[PDB]
């Protein structure tokens, strides 16, 4: 299907790395349902957050997942051979950190390695969960000094969700990533990638470890920390669509997610160009396919423009010069798009006189 | 020279993604069309007439390419994939190129989501001298000239 | 390729059903002067005109590939030309002429086309069939302009494919895959390198060729 | 050689199961046609127009065969069997074959549940020269190209 | 522009694929007297008739501008004329004639049109393609008209773009803009001067002209 199909859009698959009883070791297993997960891996039979994360991901709505087990009693390099993965998580890192067996430096090194791996593949964005029992000032200090990450492929989620554990019948604190990733998938099934996955409900969440007020959010939001807050009559909702990047142009999660999705779809659709002649015919075919793919995105309103020309532009003609990048057997295509920024703040002004 | 100064000879070609077709004997009319919408109203106070024509939606068509009958059954396989409902692979992007001398593409018509819907075999006669001709009707939702 | 067809016609006529006697096939124009000198029963196969079969012409960029399963040339389909031969039988007795014409008809009827392998090297290099029509379907004017006198004749039509090959070359194959650069239309976000195809994707695409 | 390289000459034949017919003079067009359904919609939020063309059902048809009529009345018996309601024996599987130069079958249109629906005698003229022909219209539920 | 078409044909025939022998290309009429004097293998390219391509004619005042990006002349599109050449090969042996005709056809086939670079100065000043069609579809009557005898032949059609040169001259450019005078139709208010374009508008137009 890779030699005749045109460029088409991409399902969202989350790769989970952690500890779980039974199952394979360091082997990425594709799981489509919770029943498949308990048939292959183990249920809640240990002090591991992987089962909770997978349960939250599937309960919130998830098409598929790639579960990876590295040390499950009773690893990112293996995820480089999979293309459909669009997000990753390490739920059991904080589980090991809580016991004191793993210090904070090792956790920071692991998170840096995960961010670097995400930057390499170029098609996925990582989700970061902070250590538990932290305040607004504590998390600000942790994010700005001890863990000062700066990357366009990372999103941090501060407060920990408290979900239900059938093993003990009580409420346990787990990182929100396993749930948060699921929310992302719901967006891709209900509103598309072009819409920031902010105003969504954490279905599996019962309570939060600490309620965040607007005063603390006023300092948490600008430093790229996305919060989870409970609103009366609305439930538990995510608040924030920012990445852990210092670049103002890449400070919104939706823009980066849409760019990654478009790049991955184009790369998947252009897999037949290998061993094809580097002449004007191939360039014309590439331009036609990219235009036919992008016009559908323009019609859906993801891009801004009165006409397709002002919303997207494709240049693959004569850009690949004969002596540079053509003698190297490469074809270069340039694409420009115009996304739409979200409305973070809504301001109302009431006047007595009328 | 000038763009209008170079004429176009009937040296054409086709390219369908997934369908291995090299040459065509003839190609029907492909047009870009639009809907005109007349509306007549009298100017209200004084009574003088004022008819206006205004743009409507663009239109899909059906470009058909005819190729000599041979052993190859690319169009047969295309229509077979069409009749079974497997339109994830039946809907293809097509291109009709027309070039001047020196074999340099001059004009290109891109057919978006083109999909064949009718294959007709030429009439067979015992005393016939010409080769058998296969007619293919390829309908398209959108045609973009480039 | 006209002479290749001629040789084919000569071999077919001499090696056909007329093996009883050593008849002579000649391509000379059957004028009065030519007819007044012959003294043996002969078969004249005079070429009359050359026309292009516009109904069998195909236009397109035919891909030509080497042993590496990669296309290296872009050619055009060959154009078919209709060569017409006036075939006559010359013998002293008119009934013998009729018998010779009947023998020629019998030896030329069963060959509707021509297999590529029986053709000479130049004609057989195309590996395409060569249609042959005998008396498929004005002859007085042709005979008058030729200079001879009206006689029963065969209008042998042979469709020779002449390759109109421009031998246009194609670009080098793409081995590193495709790279896509994305950004803003108005240039607000700077254009990125955008990376390219992963090595495993390129390897899978290469392996899927077989 | 290549499947596209070898052309097809108008050398054909028919085979009807139960009807002893060997040669014909002409065969009408054999069409493999699918219905096309056009639907126009407008995007709810943005108002852009999207026209989609999707598939219908396989269409049944009929091809006329015209042979040099003679004493043989195989088609007469066929239409007589069809006329009296004996459709168990009237419905036959047909095949239309087009061969290469070597008389080797290339295309075999298989015709499912075919029964003759109309037999027409050619116009008779006193000063007519050519042979008087017979036209046969056969309706087939399905026409699969093999 | 026939003295350029014939020269192009001679250069193409001499400089084509027939470089094995120095054949002679002659434009003389292939009559019986001419055929009875030649003693070497030759190629006859006799001009037959001149007709106007009425299907490719265009009517319209084409603007001709100087280096100032202002139109100074008005002309008409060139008219295309079809020139027909009867091409024959003359050699002692009929098979040699057939192979010579085949070589001529092979060397004339690849050139569908002619780029202005190949054309001489007079025809190349047009900077327009010159279509050249070989064969592509009465020859008995033509051969009888020349008084010769019917032979296999090629009908070469060349489309020469002859010029139409009325060369109308346009008026001087409008530099001070346009002035408009307004008033009453019946003349009750006297007509005013109405002023004209401001210098700012003229400067803006001259800047946007680029």
Author numbering:
A (entry chain 2A): 15 to 24, 31 to 94, 252 to 531
B (entry chain 1a), D (entry chain 1f): 4 to 149
C (entry chain 0A), E (entry chain 0B): 1 to 137, 143 to 215
Sentences from the paper on this structure:
Bacterial contractile injection systems (CIS) are phage tail-like macromolecular complexes that mediate cell-cell interactions by injecting effector proteins into target cells. Using Streptomyces coelicolor as a model organism, we and others previously demonstrated that S. coelicolor CIS (CISSc) mediate a form of regulated cell death, which influences the onset of sporulation and secondary metabolite production in response to exogenous stress and unknown cellular signals. The purified assemblies were subjected to single-particle cryo-electron microscopy (cryoEM) for structure determination, yielding the first high-resolution model of the CISSc in its extended conformation, which also presents the first example of a CIS IId subtype. Our model shows that extended CISSc particles share the conserved eCIS architecture, including the three core modules: cap, sheath tube, and baseplate.
The distal end of the CISSc is capped by a tail terminator complex. This cap comprises one protein, Cis16, forming a C6-symmetrical complex that terminates the inner tube and sheath, respectively. (e) Top view (left) and side view (right) of ribbon diagrams showing the cap module of CISSc, revealing that the cap is composed of a Cis16 hexamer. The resulting maps of the baseplate and the cap reached resolutions of 3.5 and 3.4 Å, respectively.
